């Protein structure tokens, strides 16, 4: 299948070179997989989700995304026009308030929740969790991410946007999960992207068009935008049967475009998520 005039990031993950505009992908499109977006929530009524999105848990007064961020990330995972895995099932877990902030205890509860909840869902091709959030180092937050991963969920987390070593941030610094840095459309590391030995992979994160609240769209930037590209790619590869939740990050790194990025500090992987699609 081919989506013409696709957002640049989708095109990038299906090409060996920058500058293309078509997103090439297998028609299966992540059908049978499930992705939990742990964020400010998801506007499940957005037409772009085609009824494939559902809020399953909130830690606040409402399950509504009054922010937009969560809806944006979810859209990159699996909306019709802006998503990597266009037929996946999306589950929203609201651990961040409408200002986009949240306490570590809530974020941890949200991760433990997903580890259990997945047992009540029909996700024959596998389960993924996308965490476009983080703060200063916390061994407790790292441990929660490690538990989620151990439970059989492919965990993808943002590296962070402080243009610093991700070793000082969580859950980015948990080695067992898939830590995602950001790149721009010219194959440069995004100016704000964290870096470091703990990064596993890069994905498109600068100027990413996706869904927004009020049934709209908008372009924003961040490692928060790169993460759902990788989470969606994982869902897509699991549906194809190429990898499992335990090994998806490694598989993605192994099949990545290698050495194409610029401004990568020594010691940081030069790997860009790639779907290896061949018609």
């Amino acid at each position: 299948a081919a989506q013409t005039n696709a957002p640049w990031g989708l095109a990038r993950i299906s090409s060996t070179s920058p500058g293309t505009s078509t997103y090439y992908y297998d028609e299966s499109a992540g059908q049978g997989s499930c992705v939990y977006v742990i964020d400010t929530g998801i506007e499940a009524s957005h037409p772009e989700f085609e009824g494939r999105a559902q809020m399953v848990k909130t830690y606040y007064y409402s399950s509504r995304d009054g922010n937009g961020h969560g809806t944006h990330c979810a859209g990159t995972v699996g909306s019709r026009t802006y998503g990597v895995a266009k037929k996946t099932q999306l589950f929203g877990v609201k651990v961040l308030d409408d200002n986009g902030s949240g306490q570590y205890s809530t974020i941890i509860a949200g991760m433990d929740f997903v580890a259990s909840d997945k047992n009540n869902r029909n996700c024959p091709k596998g389960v993924v969790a996308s965490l476009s959030l983080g703060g200063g180092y916390s061994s407790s937050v790292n441990s929660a991410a490690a538990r989620l991963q151990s439970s059989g969920v492919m965990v993808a987390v943002a590296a962070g946007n402080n243009n610093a070593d991700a070793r000082n941030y969580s859950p980015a610094s948990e080695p067992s999960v898939c830590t995602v840095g950001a790149s721009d459309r010219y194959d440069r590391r995004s100016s704000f992207s964290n870096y470091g030995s703990v990064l596993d992979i890069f994905g498109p994160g600068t100027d990413i068009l996706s869904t927004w609240i009020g049934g709209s769209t908008r372009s924003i930037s961040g490692t928060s935008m790169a993460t759902p590209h990788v989470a969606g790619l994982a869902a897509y590869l699991m549906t194809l049967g190429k990898t499992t939740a335990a090994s998806a990050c490694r598989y993605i790194a192994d099949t990545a475009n290698k050495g194409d990025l610029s401004n990568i500090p020594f010691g940081t992987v030069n790997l860009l998520a790639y779907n290896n699609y061949q018609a």
Partner: peptide, 4 residues
């Protein structure tokens, strides 16, 4: 603890 964001706005990330």
């Amino acid at each position: 603890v964001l706005l990330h």
